[PDB]
Subunit: 362 residues, 2 copies
């Protein structure tokens, strides 16, 4: 009755530690990951302090080693001051994150020349990922070509963006991309229900035509990733709502529903939540690690999932078919039927495993 | 000084056992694989008897389990009589092999309708690979679309073929392909040296323009695979030369030379000899497995490599930079500097590992 999947990987999560632990911490965010059938996460650097230098990375690594329940890697963040300074720690990170649209004064880059400087100084064998919306996708692709290296585009959300990436791939350019579940399963049609606070997300929800273009161009999508961006309901419904949705606990149930409906195959799903994340980010295998899912159980997403401290979900009310029943991580039962069974600190930094270093020429 | 690589995978080898063991056997062919930095091979079914039914597969599995020194999976072969009969053993094979051009009376398919029948009856979640040259590439792609599933094209050798596959990928069709080293590093210019016997291979050596098109379209190539096709020198130089080159021991040195010359990156190589083979064929990770290579040592390929019983090589005289120094397979030293150190039978059938079954819906 159950289907055994390999350990799934989410390459785009915000776990809020250090500095935003009321929204989520490593322990709660990785519990959410396990309950969503995810056994490895890559955590983004827009924490407080942001992970933009070696001291901040060192702090975040110890906090994750002590709090994470699943395995992880941590991104470094590009700033207006750190190009050329990250070489000694670069290989210990998941990759480098560029925030190319509206952002915090610390990750903010004010000039494309600063993007160039990062592409030129970051080690050429290590991953670079970009938050790049609309024409910014084209712009960062140009910078990647000028510096003759690859780039990965986060959360593609629009017909415009997926078709641009499609055209770049047709020209043989080294670009990969990911799509988040809210851009496949929500649209403008849902903003009346969500309201302008809860509905705030970046990239914003697309039109029906945007959603249909992403599905029609599934072949262009290399990865799914949640962009798990937990904020409390008070923050989402308050005066200055921060953008973002929680998504770790809902991503796999949503996608399994789509598999059961024949919208994509099980293999299509596993390429995008396992094999392609591995190969783009050079993430190591996890020994004795698997996820058991039940594809027959129909349920309705409630007003909040059990684990994320966000304590809300934009998918409330959607019917899904597909449940995570059991997760085994490195030989230990990590999750069964609504209970996480590995403690904070069980998770490890995969970049410290010998098989987790990115291969490079001498 | 040494570069650590993961365990490399060759998805296209002919190991000649059962029935052609003077050309190669599991023990000698997997020694050649290890000396070439390969830790897992997928063996083709055109043996004697050919692996076209459950009894033949059972025999080949035991012979491989007893003789293989590295890990393996075995292909089943499509015949004019076995469509609809392989369902119980299909999941235990690497995949199904279709020989669509000139071949033996046992793997010979006389009608595209027989290709259709195989695409319709072989389990939809399991791999299908095709020897398909020139217009046969287009024909098998059509059959794949009619049956709405994927196909993998073996040894792409011509500008015509890579551009057709390129066009299919631009239309979002589920097709992958592999290229063999002789089609990247040899051409018509080498036939005078090789002669018409040694030079006989299928697909035949291409023109300079074919070779240049493959390099220019590297982005379209998903895998490298040797098409290791050992025949003795007596056979290659005799009256009716069989097509094929040995290649396990020369593939990685040739490609490392190209990396050192900047023709492709180390990552490009590892996508094509590790990550993409894994994800196309759902091959499991190998624990505690790695290859150490030396990228500074310049040497000239001799008249025969140490291990393959073929006892000849078409790459004789080429200068290479790159050597396999050490291979560790599942925690045991398997190869050092010209000596294989694991015995016949150390290798295992990866499809019997829990992590080596192809995931499928209930
Ligand atoms: Zn973002
Ligand atoms: Zn991302
Ligand atoms: Zn994000
Ligand atoms: Zn890798
Ligand atoms: Zn062939
Ligand atoms: Zn092949
Ligand atoms: Zn072959
Ligand atoms: Zn797989």
């Amino acid at each position: 009755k159950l289907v055994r999947l390999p350990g799934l990987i989410d390459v785009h999560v915000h776990l809020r530690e250090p500095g935003g632990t009321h929204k989520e911490d490593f322990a709660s965010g990785t519990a959410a990951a396990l309950a969503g059938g995810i056994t490895m996460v890559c955590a983004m650097p827009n924490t407080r302090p942001p992970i933009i230098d070696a001291p901040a990375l060192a702090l975040a690594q110890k906090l994750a080693e002590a709090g994470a329940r699943c395995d992880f890697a941590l991104f470094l963040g590009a700033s207006s001051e750190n190009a050329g300074t990250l070489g000694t720690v670069a290989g210990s990170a998941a990759g480098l994150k560029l925030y190319l649209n509206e952002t915090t004064s610390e990750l903010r880059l004010d000039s494309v020349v600063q993007w160039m400087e990062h592409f030129e100084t970051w080690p050429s064998h290590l991953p670079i990922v970009a938050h790049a919306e609309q024409q910014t996708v084209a712009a960062v692709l140009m910078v990647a070509q000028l510096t003759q290296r690859s780039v990965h585009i986060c959360h593609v959300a629009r017909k415009e963006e997926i078709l641009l990436i499609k055209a770049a791939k047709a020209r043989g350019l080294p670009v990969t991309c990911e799509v988040a579940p809210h851009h496949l399963f929500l649209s403008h049609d849902d903003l009346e229900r969500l309201g302008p606070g809860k509905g705030e997300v970046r990239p914003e929800l697309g039109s029906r035509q945007d959603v249909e273009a992403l599905w029609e161009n599934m072949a262009v999508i290399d990865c799914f990733a949640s962009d798990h961006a937990p904020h409390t309901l008070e923050e989402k419904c308050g005066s200055r709502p921060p953008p973002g949705f929680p998504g770790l606990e809902t991503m796999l149930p949503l996608l399994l529903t789509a598999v059961s409906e024949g919208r994509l195959s099980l293999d299509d799903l596993l390429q995008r939540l396992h094999h392609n994340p591995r190969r783009i980010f050079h993430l190591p295998p996890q020994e004795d690690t698997y996820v058991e899912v039940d594809l027959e159980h129909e349920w309705t997403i409630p007003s909040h999932m059990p684990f994320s401290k966000a304590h809300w979900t934009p998918f409330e009310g959607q019917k899904v078919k597909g449940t995570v029943r059991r997760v085994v991580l490195r030989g230990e039962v990590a999750y069964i039927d609504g209970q996480v069974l590995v403690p904070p600190g069980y998770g490890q930094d995969v970049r410290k495993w010998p098989q987790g270093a990115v291969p490079q020429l001498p």
